Amino acid sequence: MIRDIIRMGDKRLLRVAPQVTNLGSAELHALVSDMFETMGAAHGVGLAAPQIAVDLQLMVFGFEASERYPEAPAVPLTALANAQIEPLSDEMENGWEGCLSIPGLRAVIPRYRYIRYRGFAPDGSPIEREAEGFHARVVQHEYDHLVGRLYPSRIENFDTFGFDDVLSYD
Amino acid sequence: MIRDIIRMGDKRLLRVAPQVTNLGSAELHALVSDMFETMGAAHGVGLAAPQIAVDLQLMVFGFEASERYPEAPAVPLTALANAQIEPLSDEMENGWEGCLSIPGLRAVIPRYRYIRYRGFAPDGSPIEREAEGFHARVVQHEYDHLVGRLYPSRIENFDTFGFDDVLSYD
Ligand SMILES: O[C@@H]1CSc2nc3ccccc3n21
Ligand SMILES: O[C@@H]1CSc2nc3ccccc3n21
Ligand code: NA
Ligand code: NA
Secondary structure, three states: OOOOOOOOOOHHHOOOOOOOOOOOOHHHHHHHHHHHHHHHHOOOOEEEHHHHOOOOOEEEEEEOOOOOOOOOOOEEEEEEEEEEEEEOOOOEEEEEEOOOOOOOEEEEEEEEOEEEEEEEOOOOOEEEEEEEHHHHHHHHHHHHHHOOOOHHHHOOOHHHOEEOOOOOOO | OOOOOOOOOOHHHOOOOOOOOOOOOHHHHHHHHHHHHHHHHOOOOEEEHHHHOOOOOEEEEEEOOOOOOOOOOOEEEEEEEEEEEEEOOOOEEEEEEOOOOOOOEEEEEEEEOEEEEEEEOOOOOEEEEEEEHHHHHHHHHHHHHHOOOOHHHHOOOHHHOEEOOOOOOO
């Protein structure tokens, strides 16, 4: 079932989300299924549960082909509970981000080029991966939702922030 | 004649505008007339010429009653060329701002409570005023356009940035 994606300005995007404690259950499966469905109808590459007003440490993400990032390598379809992130180097990298809770806009945002992330699949099996580049940037971005943070508070160059149909920065 | 209001992301909002040198002329009058008309149809309280892709140090502003700031005292209808601004104290004050080039959004922005501004009416007579509060905040905001600056780069508390129909911060 497709859920409403709540928009920047809602206090529910601002909360610190608690852990998921129902791994392997029917309720988590249905929620995760809703999130992939919702991500998909809105053409997202990642979606964090608080963007659907569900206060949990959960995100889904991934795709083969993105309408919005027609330049980006495939990121595996992934549902991730209780995400923890560690930078594997200090190399920062700039890239374009948008967000389904901030429709119509995009900005350039610096993120770690290399990370490891860890957590659990919805069936409870553990997940740990090294990620680089866009894959990494997705996971760091969806993680910020779980701590009540959106991309605008990460912008360093406000010349790059604007509407997607109008921007012409490189 | 109502002009297109260009949207955040256009490089033309980012420029340092040159001075107006055609005070008292027919061309400036028609431009200023267009700006009041454009401000009015979009329900603005201020409009700076670069928001209409006109690269000049010019702004119009003022109103008796605002749809968007139903709480705010009347600010006199004013067209101002070659604006210069000086804070008359260091008291900063927070208040809500939006912008016609950033439709649908608003944030809390700190501005000087007290200023003086100086420049010229379109007929060439000089203007100097002390302004406080909302009047001051309008003029400082429209001035930032003339130097290629929008309000998001002034936000200190990103919890207050969001869509106008969704926000519930105090
Ligand atoms: O603009 C898209 C739609 S959803 C999403 N999550 C993201 C994380 C990083 C970079 C881009 C995105 N986007
Ligand atoms: O949201 C409105 C529409 S235009 C404008 N210029 C401004 C300057 C300061 C505070 C608010 C505004 N606004
Ligand atoms: Na918060
Ligand atoms: Na600039």
